[PDB]
């Protein structure tokens, strides 16, 4: 199992993809949907469906 960079969900082996950042971040991702919203510098604190939203948004 790998926990994602964006969104903060679980996903199991043989799914998703990884983008190795500059400054050596190994960020796993759930899907292209999660990867693409990361690529445009969007916060997970504003996007509603994500799990890192729902911690600080109190549920």
């Amino acid at each position: 199992t790998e926990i994602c960079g964006f969104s903060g969900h679980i996903f199991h082996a043989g799914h998703g993809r990884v983008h190795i950042r500059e400054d050596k971040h190994l960020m796993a991702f759930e899907s292209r949907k999660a990867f693409r919203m990361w690529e445009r510098k969007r916060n997970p604190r504003k996007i509603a469906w994500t799990e890192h939203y729902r911690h600080d948004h109190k549920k």
């Binding site: 969900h9 199991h12 799914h15 759930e30």
Partner: peptide, 15 residues
């Protein structure tokens, strides 16, 4: 070790 039983319609989150 381990086998997939996630749904195929389309992206599967839960085994």
């Amino acid at each position: 070790k381990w086998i997939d039983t996630a749904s195929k319609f389309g992206h599967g989150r839960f085994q």
